[PDB]
Amino acid sequence: QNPWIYLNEEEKNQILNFSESYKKFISKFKTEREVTAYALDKAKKLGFINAEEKKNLMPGDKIFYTCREKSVAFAIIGKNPIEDGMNFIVSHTDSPRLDAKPSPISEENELTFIKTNYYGGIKKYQWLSTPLSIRGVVFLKNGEKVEINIGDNENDPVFVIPDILNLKILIGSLPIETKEKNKVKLATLQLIKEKYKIEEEDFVSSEIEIVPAGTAKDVGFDKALIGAYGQDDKICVFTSLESIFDLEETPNKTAICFLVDKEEIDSRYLEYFVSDMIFKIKKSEYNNLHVQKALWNSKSISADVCAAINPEQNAPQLGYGIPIMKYTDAELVSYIRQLLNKNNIAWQVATLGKGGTVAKFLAGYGIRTIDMGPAVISMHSPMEITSKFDLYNAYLAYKAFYRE
């Protein structure tokens, strides 16, 4: 039946606007750090406060916990006793990219490249002959942090990985007049030094990942699809953040909107910040056994999207609802069935062969978890295709959840 049909111009416009926001978003923030900053700055406004500077913890309190520039907390304390449980969302900030080697700069056949190391489920041949953007953090010999972002931006140059007819990013040609060995390497190295104050070796340390350059676009004549890079869960990072973000009024039962990094596969940060909130709530009476009880009650949703079909009644389809995934607790599923149906939110079912890490881990603490995220096409490619209807749909699924 495809949900679109039962909508009206109003709702239809709500979707189209929410999607423009989503675009300006994934278009800008592509790396874990970048997305973290985005998230953080949004909550900084809207009124969220850092965990510290806060010994207090009252219903309606909007706070946030920072991990290490790659993960964030974001919690709005609810009316019910924090002991009776909380609701977590959890989505991963990272996505597949390249990561330059510790000592990446090298010259080959009169050309300078960056070494790089495949990260995530890359589709190799898809990264060949494509505009790339270098993004990184570099600490100098004196631990002075510097930031790079080249590829997007106006007039900005791009970098590629040539092909015929390993993974090395082309950085530059034309030499420098010197009796030194590799001239194109030096030539290029001086540029980077003159422009960034960076010297070779500053590359050890530092964190530099190569990302598909370019901006998100609309797919098809009907502009009903979004093709972009990072769709893998950034659609969830975005939608979940929104749902929790001041788009409500104090909720019964505390709301948590995690956002983890899979590089850190965070693995304990949950225990730490959740036990921190509990201590703020019961000073002289704090106690390990609480938390444990707090966590054991809580229910959580795991974002990470899932694949769809190209070119079965258990595979999802674009623009047909948020799918409730299951890899290959009925009572929790029942809770969401009703919850969604109650609000008239469109959902789907989905079985998967070979997100999972996050589903686990969460359930490892006692939190009853469920897998829910949109559905993607050309997954883990520089252009993952998603539906705008699903985008808004997810945001409604979440939130609706937060407001049980």
Could you say which DSSP state residue 153 is in?
S
Contacts of 290 (CB under 8 A, 6+ apart): 83, 278, 282
Q: Tokens standing for 201?
A: 């070796």
45, with CB counted inside 10 A (0-12, 13-18, 19+), is: exposed
Q: Which residues are annotated as a binding site for Zn(2+)?
A: 92, 380
Q: Which residues are annotated as a binding site?
A: 92, 380
Q: Tokens standing for 276?
A: 């921190």
DSSP result, 237-272 = HHHHHHHHSSSS---SS-EE---B-STT--TTHHHH
Q: Residue 13 in 3-state DSSP? A: helix
**Rounded Cα distance, 268 and 149, in Å:** 31
Instruction: For tokens 């969302």, name the residue.
Output: 89
Cis, peptide link before residue 311, omega less than 30° from 0: yes
Could you tell me the end-to-end alpha-carbon distance of the chain, in angstroms, rounded to an integer? 28
